[PDB]
Amino acid sequence: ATITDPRDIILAPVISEKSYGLIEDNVYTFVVHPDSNKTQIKIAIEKIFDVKVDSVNTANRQGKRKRTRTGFGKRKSTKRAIVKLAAGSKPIDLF
Amino acid sequence: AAVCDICGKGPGFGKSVSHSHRRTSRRWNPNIQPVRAVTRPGGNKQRINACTSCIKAGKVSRA
Amino acid sequence: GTTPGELRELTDDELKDKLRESKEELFNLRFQMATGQLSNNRRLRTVRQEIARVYTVLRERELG
RNA sequence: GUCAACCGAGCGUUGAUCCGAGGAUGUCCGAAUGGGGAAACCCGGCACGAGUGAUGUCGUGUCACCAGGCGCUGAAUAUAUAGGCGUCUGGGGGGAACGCGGGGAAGUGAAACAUCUCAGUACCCGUAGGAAGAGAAAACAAAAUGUGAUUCCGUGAGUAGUGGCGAGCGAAAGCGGAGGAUGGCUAAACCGUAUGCAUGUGAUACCGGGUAGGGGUUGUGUGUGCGGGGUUGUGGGACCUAUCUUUCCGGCUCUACCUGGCUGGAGGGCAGUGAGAAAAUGUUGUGGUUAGCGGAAAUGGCUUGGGAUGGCCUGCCGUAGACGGUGAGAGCCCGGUACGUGAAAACCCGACGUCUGUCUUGAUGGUGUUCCCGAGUAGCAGCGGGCCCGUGGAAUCUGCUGUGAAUCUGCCGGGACCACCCGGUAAGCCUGAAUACUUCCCAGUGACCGAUAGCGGAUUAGUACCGUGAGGGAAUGGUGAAAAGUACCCCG
RNA sequence: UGCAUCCGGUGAAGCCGCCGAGUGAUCGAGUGGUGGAGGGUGUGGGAGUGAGAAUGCAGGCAUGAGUAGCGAUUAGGCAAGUGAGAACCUUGCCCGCCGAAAGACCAAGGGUUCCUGGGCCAGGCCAGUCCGCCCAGGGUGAGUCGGGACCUAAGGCGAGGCCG
RNA sequence: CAUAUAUCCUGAGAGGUGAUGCAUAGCCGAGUGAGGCGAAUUCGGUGAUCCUAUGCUGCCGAGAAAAGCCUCUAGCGAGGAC
């Protein structure tokens, strides 16, 4: 029996200078499952954090290709979701 | 035109010997004739390819 | 974690809830690893194995 | 896990890591199969759930085509069919070699070349199986009072022959062996029964006789289905017809009575997952396979050495002196070896059973007559293929086209053909063993290679690279016993 | 390689020399150095058994030779700075070239070459502190833009089907 | 019944609004580089290969399909429209 939880779509947050700059504007970036869509991510975030989500922005990034002694290797490709919270705006401290 | 729809008679393969004994490949097709038969006494007619041997045997029913 | 012994003693409902809290704990551990403040790396392995165990028990119960 | 460590974290005597067997999960592509598509990525329907103030969204099943059963409907159109609808069961693709059935080259040789060879090879097509094909005489043989299914191996034999009688090609009989199953089942003539189609002296007609009813076990035909009966060459079997006859009980041969044949129930056999019918279900076999465990004897002395596993000298085991490792040649240091042991579970082999069919309403040897013994088949003719046989006097076998028989004093074969003798019984079907092979797994072997060798590939290997593409396709092994891989100083 | 004997960590093979030997292919259980684990002899057995050349193959390296060349038709100079090292890097001031381009933006194509920090064995036809080079991290945000969920052209595939 | 600069459709462009905003020449400091303030904005000429324009005229060589939009009923309908 499959039990679908909203917490498997969201994999991990994104930590970087750009992500922090978005955070000071109440905008958070997550690494989501590559087979998810904007509405699914919005619903999952609303269920997880009990927050009102205004908009979700997605972008696909190709993993970097690295040279090794064995040859060429490619890292995993990932999808990023940039979630903007509503005016209620209680910060996500789990970040 | 070479495979009977009743008994499956197929063409034969052989050689065409000339006066100088030059053997060249050739085929012996069956004498296939298109006959509209009557499968049941109801009267339905269907076009089938039956060899003349099948017609002689009465296996086809051209009623 | 929890060995299958007493895991099989639970009924379907609390098995579902145990799966759910284990998934939430895995979510928290993944976020902590992403930020990088927790030291015990084996916690992720243990939680994943508990989730697999409860899934297997549920499958056995529903199959027979 | 490993290249391949460096950390960081932890598990384990409450049995971890690891090995074997059985399960669960198994994203997307791929026969790919809901639709589409530039393979691994886009879009859906239905049903049931999850979620939302509602749409959006999520999860689980299901939705391709074709073929064959079953059921509903039956167009033009009247009978009806095609077709449509629904529901079940199958198929689809992959694989190194081996099999069978078809299609089928050329370079080459003939010192040219076309008949011929190469060669029914290369390749292509359709199909299986664990093997396949063939297989039970319409056979060989030659007067032997002879063999007796098929297959495979050795001889026969490079022979008889065949061939622009050139290059070349090339049997069979017989004999010796492997394996044995000289095996089984049917179709017909006749009965019984059911049904379809025609009609009906519609009565003196169909049961085995004699008695009595009756106008249909239809009365007659015809076809089909099923059950009996029948499997053969000294011909056999049906139709008859005497003799002898190794269970009991019951229901039927139109009807009841005395008589001969059908059908069920009880013993009694006989067989079986088998070619001879089929699907199952139990118990048991230190029977096997898929993990393992045990397993004798030197810390021996002197000496060289970094190290003894070297040399000399002492013992010990041996059902174990096979082979590797350990700081240099080790039976006694280790892993092991000889030799014994081990299976919870799964699978494979047997055996005994439940179970299934099957014979018992049966069996024997005799006598003279009608019917049957596989049909567009054999035979013949024309054009071809393959047989030693290249059309030749050309037998046997076979493809297409015409023509087209007989049922045993019948038919076929005995290398044109005729007569006599001899052998066999075609136009129906199954059959194990002896035989061929290795993608893969296990255990070994080598007067085989040892890094320009051996697989292309001991190292990133069908990789890098080359080509749009089919495709082509490399190079690179060794420190040391142990990393003890040169702390520290100096020039830079 | 069968068999029989001999040598070897007190140092075998291999390689480099000396001193010699045989009628020849060749030899030295004669020795010196290097080296570190297997060899010799006799008698038989079997060869992937002997190269100087095939415009022979693979690897390594010579002559030409420190020679040609260092890839257009625009052109660089000075001061300062960094740095072990500066004609080529950074800044500043001049000079010059293009300007229907040698300016700006897309499509196809490429795939991280883009930014930050670090580096100067490999590459840049010179050097380099620099780089489209090497290393790590970061970076691509769509209801309206180009496409799909909309439609068809050429054409492709093609249920049934016809033909073979 | 109609020949009307009538009526309607289409339509560059001018004008208003969007715009109390935004931006800018400069002025202050600040010196990687960050910040604040911020004037005037009228009138002419020239002028497109661009727009009206899938327009208009001429010509023969006679110049895609479907979706979309509008309409018509067939048909659904007790609810449905703005």
Domains and CATH numbers, chain A: 3-95 (3.30.70.330)
Torsion angle of the four alpha carbons C48, A34, A32, A4, in this order, in degrees rounded to the nearest 10: -50
**A7 CB-near residues (< 8 Å, 6+ apart):** A44, A48, C23, C24, C26, C27
Torsion angle of the four alpha carbons C29, C34, C35, C40, in this order, in degrees rounded to the nearest 10: 50
* b (16+ CB within 10 A) / e for A29-65: bbbbeeebeeebbbebbeebbebebeebeeeeeeeee
Give the separation between CA A36 and CA A26, rounded to whole angstroms.
22
Domain that holds residue C47: 1-64
Give the separation between CA C3 and CA B13, rounded to whole angstroms.
76
**B13 CB-near residues (< 8 Å, 6+ apart):** B25, B26, B27, B28
Chain C contact present for A15, CB below 8 A: yes
Q: Classify A61 as helix, strand or coil.
A: strand
Residue at token pair 């029996």 = A1
Identify whether the C-beta of residue A74 lies closer than 8 Å to the C-beta of residue A63: yes
Number of domains in chain C: 1
Chain A residues near residue C24 by CB distance under 8 angstroms = 5, 7
> Which value in Å is the resolution of this experimental model?
2.7
Residue type, C18: K
Cβ of A82 near strand E (distance < 7 A): yes
**Burial category of A88 from C-beta neighbours within 10 Å (exposed 0-12, middle 13-18, buried 19 and up):** exposed
The CA–C1' separation of B54 and D123, in angstroms, is 37
The CA–C1' separation of C7 and D168, in angstroms, is 87
Identify whether the C-beta of residue C31 lies closer than 8 Å to the C-beta of residue A94: yes
Identify whether the C-beta of residue A9 lies closer than 8 Å to the C-beta of residue A41: yes
Alpha helices in C1-64 (DSSP H): 4-7, 12-35, 42-63
Give the separation between CA B32 and CA B56, rounded to whole angstroms.
12
